[PDB]
Amino acid sequence: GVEIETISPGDGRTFPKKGQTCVVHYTGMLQNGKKFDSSRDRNKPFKFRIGKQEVIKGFEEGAAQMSLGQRAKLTCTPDVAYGATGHPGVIPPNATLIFDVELLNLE
Template sequence: SLTDGRKFDSSRDRDKAFRFKLGKQEVIRGWEEGVGQMSVGQRAKLICSPDYAYGNKGHPGIIPPNATLIFDVELLSLE
């Protein structure tokens, strides 16, 4: 979510886990570093400053420029 509480995406709402590979630049830097330190079954709040998220460009139509993002993340499995 954004710092004002607006939700921009939720894999929980879709009832489908978000899958990605660490180290492949598939996700923002905040996820690479935050999820990379988690253990299976752990839940964490990741607060990503713009330089660890989408920076000064944002993601047009979804995330404004220079946005700090807050994620509620649960690591379900590792492969």
């Protein structure tokens, strides 16, 4: 499940398609916990394409529901990213993930 909470401004019509590399200023957040990842620190805003299963399932489906300029807020379920396995040292198992996502993309 992907729960979108959009901070309003954008256009609402430029949607990502297949094979389009898009740019996201993501910012990860643990529920009742601190941060774990952000693109604002590296300032390398993560040019990734759509439709190759590169990103996790909670982040891929939310990018298809956003548009250019929009600033949403993800709520990623554990069963799609790390709930059974868990990343070693960073994400424990059964973890609900929160992301500050703005789509200022290309292509």
